[PDB]
Every structure is written in structure tokens, then in C-alpha cells.
Amino acid sequence: FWGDSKLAPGGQEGLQFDGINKMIDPENTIDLKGNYLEEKHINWGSQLILQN
Amino acid sequence: MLFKYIHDVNAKVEEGRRYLSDVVRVALDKEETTDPDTQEVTSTSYRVTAYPVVQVGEEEVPYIPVHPKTAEPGQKVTVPTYDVPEKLPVLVRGRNPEATGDYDDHIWVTEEVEVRPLVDEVFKEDEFEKARLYYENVAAQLAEGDDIRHYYRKDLDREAGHYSVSRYPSF
After folding, report:
1. Which residue of B has its CA nearest to A27?
2. Cα B90–chain centre separation
3. Are B56 and B88 in contact (CB under 8 A)?
4. Within 13 Å and on the Cβ side, how many CA atoms surround B138?
């Protein structure tokens, strides 16, 4: 989940592999702004996946 | 005009709307922008263009022989000069408003149309190699015996694989 592969000084290359949190494209991000997850957000995620 | 190439197109190309002359000129040129006060240049760019041209005169140039030929030490030959025109004619079908019978109703009329460049590309002060490659490709594609068909440039294009943006109609 939280692996990062660019943690060497200068951001060259680390000893870890990239986790899910990083391989996911930054465009497919929904920010809830510190609130609860509700029913409509499931449809929002479904739309974000369907359009691709 | 750093480079200059004069090419002769055939009848099929000469009949196209964009090619209304028997000779096409391809050239590469350098441009500069200077401050009004003095010659302090601000930027430099290279432009590649292709134009239908007309003959406007002649000039004296040295003679360059080819392998099966030999030339005198100071032999010279005359070649024409070219310039960009303003309007070129073309014949289209039409009707006679004052016709008197069935034999003079359909005619051919001559209309003059505006002349536009075939190619017009701009390159920055760097990447002179890219401009040279584009010029050579245009010249070779003209020499292939058909129209100029390829204009794709990777630098000036939309990002590929962006599905959320490429889904909109373009047809």
C-alpha cells in the first residue's frame, strides 16, 4: 500500500517498490475534505473508472 | 533564404486547387526580431515554406556539369528567377445568364483565386536540425511525384492516452 521507490537522496532510486498509492494515476483522485464517505461517492468512483 | 529548391510538378498536381503553377519552390529562411532603438536582436527563428511561383526574370549563374559531361573553366548558364504571385486562374462550369438557345447555355468561366502557401512552419533558435530535416522531407516527398501529404509534428500535438479528454467529438 505505501511503498515508495524514489526515496534515495536526489530522488534517484530506492530499495523499495512502488505501492498502489503511487501507481494509481493522480487524475483519479477524489478528495473528501475530512468528511464521511456516503452513497453518492460510490457512484462518483464508478463513473471515474467507467469513463476510462 | 539559406536553401532554395525549385521542383517541377506534373499535370495531375498542376490541376489541384493548391497547385496552380508548373513550378513549386521550397525554401528555408532565418528570421530575427530587433528592438526599435538599435540592432539588439531579441529572438531568432527558422521558417520552412513552400509556394507556387511564377517567372519574373533571368540571371547569370555558373555552370555545374554532371559526370557524363565536361565544362569550360568559366562557362556560365542562364536560369529564371521566381516570385510569389497574388492570384491564379482556374476554370469551372457555369451558366450563361443571357443565353439564347440550347447550344450556348453551358459554358466554362474563368475565376481568379487567392494563393496560399503549401507549408508554413516555425522553429525556435535551437533545433535547426529539426527544421533541416523537415525541409529535406518536404523536398523528398515532392520529388516522390505526388502532392505534399504529411504534416504531422510531434511537438505540436495533443497528449496521447488521455481518455478523459480524447472522448469528445472531433469527426
Report:
1. B164
2. 18
3. no
4. 28
Cα–Cα distances (Å) from B62 to A42, B77, B78, B80, B171, in that order, read 79, 6, 8, 13, 53
Chain A residues close to B167, C-beta within 8 Å? 51
Place of cell 527563428: B45
Give how far the C-alpha of residue A39 lies from the chain's centroid of Cα atoms, to the nearest Å.
Answer: 20
Q: How far apart are CA B110 and CA B120, in angstroms?
A: 28
Structure determined by: cryo-EM
Distance from CA of B126 to the nearest CA of A (A): 29
Is any Cβ of chain A less than 8 angstroms from the Cβ of B167? yes
* Residue B129: alpha-carbon gap to chain centroid: 20
- Show Cβ contacts of residue B140 under 8 Å, excluding neighbours closer than 6 positions: none
Measured CA angle at B42 (ends B37, B48), to 5 deg: 125
Angle at B98 between CA B97 and CA B99, to 5 degrees: 100
Resolution in A: 3.0
Q: How big is the CA angle at B94 (ends B88 and B95), to the nearest 5 degrees? A: 145
